[PDB]
Amino acid sequence: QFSEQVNYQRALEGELARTIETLGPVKSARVHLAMPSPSASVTVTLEPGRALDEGQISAVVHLVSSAVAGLPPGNVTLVDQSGHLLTQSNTSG
Amino acid sequence: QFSEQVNYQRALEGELARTIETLGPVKSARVHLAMPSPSASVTVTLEPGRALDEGQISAVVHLVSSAVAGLPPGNVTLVDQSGHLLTQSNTSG
Amino acid sequence: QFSEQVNYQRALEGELARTIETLGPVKSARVHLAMPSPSASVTVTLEPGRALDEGQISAVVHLVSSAVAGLPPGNVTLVDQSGHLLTQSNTSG
Amino acid sequence: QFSEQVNYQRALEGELARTIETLGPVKSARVHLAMPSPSASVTVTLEPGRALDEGQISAVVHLVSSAVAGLPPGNVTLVDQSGHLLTQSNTSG
Amino acid sequence: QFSEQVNYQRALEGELARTIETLGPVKSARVHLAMPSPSASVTVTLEPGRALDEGQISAVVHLVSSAVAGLPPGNVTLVDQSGHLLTQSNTSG
Amino acid sequence: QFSEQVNYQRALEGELARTIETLGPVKSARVHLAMPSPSASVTVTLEPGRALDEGQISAVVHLVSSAVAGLPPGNVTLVDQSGHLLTQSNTSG
Amino acid sequence: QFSEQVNYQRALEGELARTIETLGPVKSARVHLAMPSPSASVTVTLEPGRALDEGQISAVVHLVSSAVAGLPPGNVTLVDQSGHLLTQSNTSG
Amino acid sequence: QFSEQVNYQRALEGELARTIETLGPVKSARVHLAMPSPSASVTVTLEPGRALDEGQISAVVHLVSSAVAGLPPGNVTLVDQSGHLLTQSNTSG
Amino acid sequence: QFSEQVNYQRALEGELARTIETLGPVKSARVHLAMPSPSASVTVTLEPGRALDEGQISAVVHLVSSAVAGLPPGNVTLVDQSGHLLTQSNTSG
Amino acid sequence: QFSEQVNYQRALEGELARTIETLGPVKSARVHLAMPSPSASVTVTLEPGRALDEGQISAVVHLVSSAVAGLPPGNVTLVDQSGHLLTQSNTSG
Amino acid sequence: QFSEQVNYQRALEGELARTIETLGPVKSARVHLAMPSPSASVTVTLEPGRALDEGQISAVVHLVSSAVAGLPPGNVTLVDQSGHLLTQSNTSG
Amino acid sequence: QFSEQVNYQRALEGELARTIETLGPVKSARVHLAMPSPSASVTVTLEPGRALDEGQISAVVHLVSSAVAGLPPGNVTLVDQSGHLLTQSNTSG
Amino acid sequence: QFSEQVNYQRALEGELARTIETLGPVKSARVHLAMPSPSASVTVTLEPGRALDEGQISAVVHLVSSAVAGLPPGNVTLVDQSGHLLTQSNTSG
Amino acid sequence: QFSEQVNYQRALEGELARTIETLGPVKSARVHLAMPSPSASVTVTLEPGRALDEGQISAVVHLVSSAVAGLPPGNVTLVDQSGHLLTQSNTSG
Amino acid sequence: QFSEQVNYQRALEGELARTIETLGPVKSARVHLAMPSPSASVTVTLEPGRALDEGQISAVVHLVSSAVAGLPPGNVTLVDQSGHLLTQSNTSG
Amino acid sequence: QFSEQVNYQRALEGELARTIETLGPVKSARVHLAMPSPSASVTVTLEPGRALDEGQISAVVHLVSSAVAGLPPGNVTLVDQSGHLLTQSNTSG
Amino acid sequence: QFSEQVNYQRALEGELARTIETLGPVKSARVHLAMPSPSASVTVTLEPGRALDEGQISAVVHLVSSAVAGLPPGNVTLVDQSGHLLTQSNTSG
Amino acid sequence: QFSEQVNYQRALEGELARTIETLGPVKSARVHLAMPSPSASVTVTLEPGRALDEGQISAVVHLVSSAVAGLPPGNVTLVDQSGHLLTQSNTSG
Amino acid sequence: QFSEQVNYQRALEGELARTIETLGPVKSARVHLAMPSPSASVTVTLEPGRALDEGQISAVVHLVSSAVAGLPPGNVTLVDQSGHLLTQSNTSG
Amino acid sequence: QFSEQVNYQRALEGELARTIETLGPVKSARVHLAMPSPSASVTVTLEPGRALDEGQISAVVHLVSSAVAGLPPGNVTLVDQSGHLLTQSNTSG
Amino acid sequence: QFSEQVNYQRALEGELARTIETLGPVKSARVHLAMPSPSASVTVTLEPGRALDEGQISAVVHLVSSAVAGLPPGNVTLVDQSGHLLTQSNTSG
Amino acid sequence: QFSEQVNYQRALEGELARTIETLGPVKSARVHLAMPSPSASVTVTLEPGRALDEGQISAVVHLVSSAVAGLPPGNVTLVDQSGHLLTQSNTSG
């Protein structure tokens, strides 16, 4: 049963990575899921010379926070390829 | 049993993706289902030089929110191929 | 048992799609069933240069809402091949 | 058991379709049964240049509403090959 | 058991159809039985240029309403080959 | 057991048909039995140019109503080869 | 057991038919037994130009009413080869 | 057991028929037994030109009423080869 | 067990018939036993030109009434080869 | 067990017959035993021109009444080869 | 067990017959035993021209009444080869 | 067990007969034992021209009454080869 | 067990006979044992011309009464080869 | 077990006989044991011309009364080869 | 077990006999053991011309009374080869 | 089960190490997980001549603290390739 | 078990005999053990011309009374090869 | 299970040793884990001519105290390759 | 178990004998153990011309009384090769 | 289980010995563990011409007292290759 | 189990003997263990011309009294090769 | 289990002997363990011309008293190769 659960989690991770790669100016990303108020970690590798709107960074936030049950939109930690802690709501300091 | 459930979910995802592709100015899309007040994530790849009405974007919203049980019309997150967080009801800020 | 249920649902979907295709100015459609106050989604692909009466759009609504148990006539979401959210009763805004 | 029930329902559907085809100016029809106050859907394809009486449209209504147990005569939805929602009792608006 | 019941019902239907065909000016008919106050549906194909008495149409009514247990004489719906809802007692309007 | 019962009923039907055929001016008849106050249906094919007494039509009535248990003499519906509802006691109108 | 009972009843019927045939001016008859106040049906084929006494018609009545247990002498229905309802006690009208 | 009983009854019938045949002016007779106040039926075929005393007709009555248990002497129905209901005690009218 | 009983009864009948044949002016007789106040039936075939005393007819009566348990001397019915109901005690009328 | 009893009874009968034959002027006799106040039947065939004393007829009576348990000396019925009911005590009339 | 008992009784009978034969003027005798106040039967065949004392006839009586348990000396019935009921104590009349 | 008992009794009888034969003027005797106050029977065959004392006839009495348990000296019945009931104590009359 | 007991008794008898034979003027004797106040029987065959003392006849009495348990010295019955009832204590008359 | 006991008793008897033979003027003796106040029997065969003391006859008495448990010295019966009842204590008369 | 006990007793007897033989002027002796206040029997065969002290006859007494459990020194009966009852304590008369 | 858990932990460690390596100026790192307020240890090997922001060091902290359930952001210990205890919140001294 | 005990006792006897033989002026002795206040018997064969002290005769007494459990020093009976009852404590008279 | 635990502990030890070796100026170290307030022992072999900060010695302390559950930062004992007890908090003297 | 105990006792005896032989002026001894206040027997064979101290005779006493559990030093009986009861404490008289 | 524990203890001993050997001026040492306030024994073989600080002897003490659970730092006994009881805290005298 | 215990005791004895032999001026010794306040026996064979201190005789005492559990130092009995009861504490007289 | 314990004890003994041999001026020693306040025995063989400090004799005492659980430092008995009871604390006299 645990093997089935971990395989399902890995397949979800692969599908999510493929979909977020299918976003235009992104060659690849790396998503990891955390299941206990859950949370998730996104490490986007943004393509150089490209920058999407805040309304589309929230698009990435809600894209990853929606397709998984119980993930609040404010619990996704978004980090680019070199620093750039964009989620100021988590790190409110 | 869990394998049957996941296969049924994947088949539903494939059928829904095919139907939403069968919408004219869309080559392909990517739907993911979230089952616990459920919710779903749609990442449409709109064809360039095409733009459908708001009454037909709500058509996509209700098309994905209807064919699955218990999905409210206000819980679908719609994102185009490059940002464009169209669903302002979820992100009411 | 679940396989039998899903096969029966798929066969019903295929038969319904064939019957709604057998309506004159329609080459093909795509029906999906939602079973919990149930609801259903219809994505008709109307033939160009053809337009049926409102009393025959309600014919499609009742045709899909009747042959399945417990589906109210006001819960069918009807969308043409390009937008055109015809069901104003669901989207009363 | 469920397979026996669905096969019996399909055989009833085929027999009913053959009998309603055996009505003169009809090449073929499409009946679907709904079992929970049940109801049924009839999509007649009337032959061009032919039109039967109201007392014989009620003949079709009672022909389909009688040979199945518990189907009230006012719950049959009758639609021709192109719109023409004839049953005004269901759609009393 | 259900297969035995359905085979017995089909054999009764065939025998009844043969007997009602054995009535003179009738090449063939189509009877269907409904078992829950039961009821039945008769679709007679009367031979052209022939018309039997009302006391012999009631002969058909009682012929089909008698050989089956519990069928009241007023619950048989009689329809000719083209409309002609003869049973005015059911459709008392 | 049900097969034995139906075979016994069919054999009784065949024997009764042979005996009623063995009545002189009758080439063949068709009897059907109804078992729940039971009743039965007789469709005699009287030979042309022949007509038996009322005291011998009651002979047919009691001949079919006697050889089967519990069948009252007033419950037999007698119909000739073309209409002629002779049993006025059932149809007292 | 039921097969044994029906075979015994058929053998009794055959023996009774042979004995009543062994009565002089009778080539053959047809007896049927009814078992629930039981009753029986006799269809004698009297030889032309022959007529037995009333005290010997009652001989036939008691001959068939005696050799079977519990059959009252007044419950036998006697019919000749063409009408002739002789038993006026049953049909006292 | 029932087969043994019926075979014993048939053997008794055969023996009784042989003994009553062994009575002089009788070529053959036909006895049938009725077992529930029981009763029996005798159909003697008296030889022409012969007639035995009443004290020897009562001999036949008691001969058949004695060799079987519980048969009263007044319950035997005696009929010759052509009518002649001799037992006036049963038919006291 | 029943077969043993019937074989014993038949052997007793044969022995009794042989003994009563061994009585001088008797070529053969026919005895039948009745077992429930029992009774028995004797059909003697007296040799012509011979007649035994009443004290030896009572010899036959007691000969058959003694060798079987519980048979009273007044319950034996004695009949010659042609009528002649000798036992006036049974038929006291 | 019943076969053993009947064989023992038959052997007793044979031995008794042989002993009573061993009495001088008797070629053969025929004894039958009756077992419920029991009784027995003796049919002696006395040799012609011979007659034994009454004190030796009582010898036969006690010879048959003694060698069997419980048989009273007054219950033996003695009959010669032609009538001659010698036992006047049984037939005291 | 019953076979053992009857064989023992027969062996006792044979031995007793041999011993009573071993008495001088007796070629053979015939003893039978009766077991329920028991009793026994002796049929002596006395040699002609020989006659033993009364004190030796009582010798025979006690010889047969002693070697068997419970047989009183007054219950033995003694009969010669031709009548001669010697035991006047049993037949005290 | 019963066979063992009867064989032991027969062996005792043989031994006793041999011993009583071993008494001088006796060629052979015949003893029989009776076991329920028991008793026994002795049939001595005294040699002609020999006569033993009364004190030695009592020797025979006590010789047979001693070697068997419970046999009183007054219950032995002594009979010579021709009558001669010597035991006057048993027959005290 | 009974066979063992009887064999032991017979062996005791043989040994006792041998010992009493081993007494001088005795060629052979015959002892029999009686076991229920028991008793025994001795039949000595004294050699002619020899006579032992009374104190040695009591020697024989005590020799046989001692080697067996529970045999009183006054219960041994002593008889010579020809009468001579020596034990006057038993026969005290 | 009983065989073991009897073999042990016989071996004791043989050993005792050998020891008493081993006494000088004795060629052989015969001892028998009696086991219920037990007792024993000794039949010594004293050698002619020899006579042992009374204190050595008591030696024999105590020799046989000691080596067996529970045998009192006054219960041994001593008899020579010809009478000579030496034990006057047992026979104190 | 009993065989083991008797073999042990016999071995003890043999050993004791050998030891008492090993006493000088004794060629052989014969000891027998009695086990219920037990006792024992010694039959010494003293060598001629030899006589041991009383303090050594008591040596034999205690030698046999000691090596066996529970044997009192006053219960040993000592007898020489010819009478000589030495133990005056047992025979204190 | 424990092997499955440790393999899952090792796979998580490998994936996390690969992702943190996929951060630009990092050739490799070494993560270890601690599961009981849990905690974790990170030993980054920063590439020479590179230094990321504090808002991206907190990016590493939250990247490792998010993808694992229940890890607070203040419990991650971050150490470079040579000392440099950057996390001053843990070591608040 | 009893065989083991007797073998152990015999081995103890052999060892004790060997040790007491190993005493100088003794070629062999004979010890027997008595086990219920137990006791033992010693029959020493002292070598001629040798005599040990009383303090060494008590040495033999205690040597045999010590090596066996529970044997009191005053219960050993010591006898030389010819009388000489040395133990005056046992025989204190 | 214990083998699995010890193998897991050894693998953790090996991984920790490899990671601490991966720290620059360290060729190898030796870690041992202690599991009951747990504690651990570190024996670092610092490379000559190298010395890291106190804030990086605390880096080693927290690196080993973090990756294992429940290890407080003050319970790690740190010793270089030659003495140098650096942890003054444990050894506070 | 008993065999193991006796073998252990014999091995202890052999070892003790070897050790006491290993004492200088002793070629061999003989020890026997007595186990119920236990006791033991020692039969030393002292070498001629040798005599050890009393403090070394007590050495032998304690040497044998110590190596076995529960043996008091005052319960060892010491005897030389010819009398010499040295232990005056046991024999305190 | 005990074998697993002892093997684990031996492996810990070997690893600890190797680590303490890996301390510079030590060729080999010998550690033994004591498990019940536990304790341990260290026998260091210090290399000649080398002497570490007291703060590094306490390093050895805590190195061995830390890597094993529950060992207090004051319970380790430290001894060099030749005496030199360094731990004065244990031996506080 | 007992065999294991005795083998362990023997191995302990052998090891102790070897160690006490390894004491310089001792070629061999003999130790025996006594287990119930236990005790032990030592028989030292001191080498001639050698004598150890009292503080080293107590060394032997404590050497044997220590390596075995529960042996008090005052319960060891020490004896040289020829007398010399050194332990005056045990033999305090 | 006991074999495992004894093997573990022997292995501990061997290891301890090897370690104490590894002490410089010692070629070999002999340690024995005593397990019930336990105790132990050490027999050191000190090398000639060598003498370690008292603080290193206490080193040996604590070296053997530490590596075994529960052994107090004052319960070790230390003896050199020739007397020299060094432990004055045990022998405080």
**Which run of H or E residues covers position D39?**
strand D39-46
Biggest CA-to-CA distance, chain K: 45
* Nearest-10 Cα torsion for I9, I14, I16, I22: -170
Q: Strand, helix or coil at M33?
A: strand
Q: Give me the residues paired with residue K26 across strands.
A: K46
Q: State the DSSP code for E71.
A: -
Per CB-CB distance under 8 Å, the chain G contacts of F53 are 83-84
CA distance J20 to J8: 18
Are V79 and V85 in contact by the 8 Å Cβ rule? The answer is yes
**Does the distance separating the beta carbons of H8 and I85 come in below 8 Å?**
no
Partner residue opposite N62 with nearest CB, options O2, O30, O90: O90
Alpha carbons H57 and E81: distance in angstroms, whole number: 71
Q: Name which of N16, N57, N12, Q32 is nearest O30 in CA terms.
A: N16
Tokens encoding T39: 């304790």
**Beta-carbon-side half-sphere exposure of residue S19 (alpha carbons within 13 Å):** 25
Instruction: Give long-range contacts, CB 8 A cutoff, 24+ apart: P61-66.
Output: P61/P87, P62/A41, P62/A77, P62/A79, P62/A85, P62/A90, P62/A91, P63/A41, P63/A43, P63/A77, P63/A79, P63/P19, P63/P20, P64/P16, P64/P20, P64/P31, P64/P40, P65/P40, P66/A32, P66/A34, P66/A39, P66/A40, P66/A41, P66/A77
Which CB contacts under 8 angstroms, 24+ apart, belong to A10-16? A12/A68, A15/B32, A16/A64, A16/A67, A16/B32
Closest CA to H29 of H11, H44, H13, H14: H44
3-state secondary structure O21-82: HCCCCEEEEEEEEECCCCEEEEEEEECCCCCCCHHHHHHHHHHHHHCCCCCCHHHEEEECCC
d(CA G42, CA G33): 9
Structure tokens at P2: 């424990």
Chain O: residue nearest N70 by CA? Answer: O36
CB D17 within 8 A of CB C19: no
| Beta-bridge partners for G26 | G46
- What are the tokens at S7? 């073998």
The dihedral over CA atoms of H67, H68, H74, H75, expressed in degrees to the nearest 10, equals -140
What is the C-alpha to C-alpha distance for residues S2 and H83, in angstroms, rounded to an integer? 112
Handedness of CA D3, D9, D10, D11 (dihedral sign): positive
Residue at K25: amino acid letter: P
Whole-angstrom distance between the N-terminal and C-terminal Cα of chain A?
A: 42
K45 in Cβ contact with K27 (< 8 Å): yes
C44: left (phi over 0), alpha (psi -120 to 50) or beta: beta
Interchain contact V88–U (C-beta under 8 A): no
Q: How far is CA K67 from CA J64, K10, K32, L1, L74, in A?
A: 22, 15, 14, 22, 15
Cα–Cα distances in angstroms (integers) from residue H45 to residues H17, H42, H52, H57, S77, in the given order: 12, 10, 13, 13, 132
Distance CA I78, CA H63 (A): 9
Which residues, at least 6 apart from U5, have a Cβ–Cβ distance to it below 8 Å?
none
Count of other CB atoms within 10 angstroms of residue M50: 10
In eight-state DSSP terms, residue D74 is: G
Encoding tokens for residue L5? Answer: 């008992």
Order across the sheet with K76-79: list the strands. K26-34, K39-46, K76-79
Minimal C-alpha gap between V88 and chain T (Å):
16
Paired tokens of J20: 């009573």
**DSSP, res Q58:** H
Tell whether the torsion through CA atoms of C39, C42, C43 and C49 is positive or negative: negative
Which positions in chain J touch K20 (Cβ < 8 Å)? none
Can chain P be said to touch chain A, i.e. do they have 3 or more Cβ pairs within 8 angstroms?
Answer: yes
Are T60 and T87 in contact, with CB atoms under 8 Å apart? no
Question: V63 is written with which tokens?
Answer: 């070296």
Report how far residue H50's alpha carbon sits from residue H18's, in angstroms, rounded to the nearest whole number. 19
Nearest to F37 by CA among C25, M90, E69: E69
User: In whole angstroms, what is the distance from residue L74 CA to residue K11 CA?
Assistant: 28
d(CA V47, CA V26): 5
Phi, psi of P35 (to 5 degrees): -120, 120
Rounded distance, CA J17 to CA J40, Å?
13
H or E stretch including P46? strand P39-46
Q: Given an 8 Å threshold on Cβ–Cβ distance, is V16 in contact with T6? A: no
* Three-state SS sequence of Q6-24: HHHHHHHHHHHHHHHHCCC
Q: Could you tell me the resolution of this structure in angstroms?
A: 3.8
Give the three-class secondary structure for T72.
coil
**F38 to chain G nearest CA, in Å?**
13
What kind of experiment solved this structure?
Answer: cryo-EM
Q: Does A57 touch chain P (CB under 8 A)?
A: no
C74-90 b/e with 16+ CB inside 10 Å = b? ebbbbbbbebebbbeeb
**What single DSSP character describes residue E78?**
E
Interchain contact, G67 vs H34, CB within 8 Å: yes
Burial (CB < 10 A; 0-12, 13-18, 19+), residue F12, is middle
Query: Are the beta carbons of V84 and U19 separated by less than 8 Å?
Result: no
| Nearest Cα to Cα of residue P85 among R26, R60, R15, R78 | R60
Structural contact between residues U79 and S62, judged by C-beta atoms closer than 8 angstroms: yes
How close O21 comes to chain N (CA, Å)? 15
Measured in whole angstroms, how far is the alpha carbon of residue L57 from the centre of its chain?
10
Contact C18, C49 (CB under 8 A): no
Q: How far apart are CA N68 and CA N13, in angstroms?
A: 11
Residue V32, classed as helix, strand or coil, is strand
B70 shares contact with chain C (CB less than 8 Å): yes
Distance CA N76, CA N33 (A): 10
Q: Dig out the tokens for S73 from the structure.
A: 């030093």
Q: Which two tokens stand for residue S66?
A: 């110590």
Q: Nearest-CA distance from U91 to chain S in Å?
A: 9
Q: Identify all chain P residues contacting R52, using CB atoms and an 8 Å cutoff.
A: 82-83
Contacting residues of R for T57, CB less than 8 Å apart = 83
Q: Specify the amino acid at residue F91.
A: T
State the CB neighbour count (10 A cutoff) for residue H3: 10
By CB atoms closer than 10 A (0-12, 13-18, 19+), residue M22 is middle
Residues 7-46 of E with CB under 8 A from D: 30, 32-36, 38-41, 43, 45
State the DSSP H helix or E strand holding residue P63, giving kind and residue range, or none if neither.
Answer: helix P54-66
CA distance P61 to P31: 12
- By the 10 Å C-beta count (0-12 exposed, 13-18 middle, 19+ buried), V49 is classed as exposed
Neighbouring C-beta atoms of residue I67, cutoff 10 Å: 23
CB M67 to CB N41 under 8 A? yes
L84/L87 Cα distance (integer angstroms): 9
Give the gap in angstroms from C-alpha G57 to the nearest C-alpha of chain F.
16
R10-22 in b/e form (b: 16+ CB < 10 A) is: eebeebbeebbee
Calculate how close chain O gets to N77, using CA atoms only, in Å: 18
Candidates O86, O91, O93; CA nearest to O42 is: O86
Pick the residue from chain O with its C-alpha nearest to N56: O83
How far separated are the first and last CA of chain J, in Å rounded?
Answer: 42
- Give the count of alpha carbons within 13 A of F54, CB side only: 5
At least 3 CB pairs under 8 A between chains A and B: yes
Q: Which helix (H) or strand (E) holds L13?
A: helix L2-21
Other beta carbons less than 10 A from residue R74's beta carbon:
11
Contact I55, J84 (CB under 8 A): yes
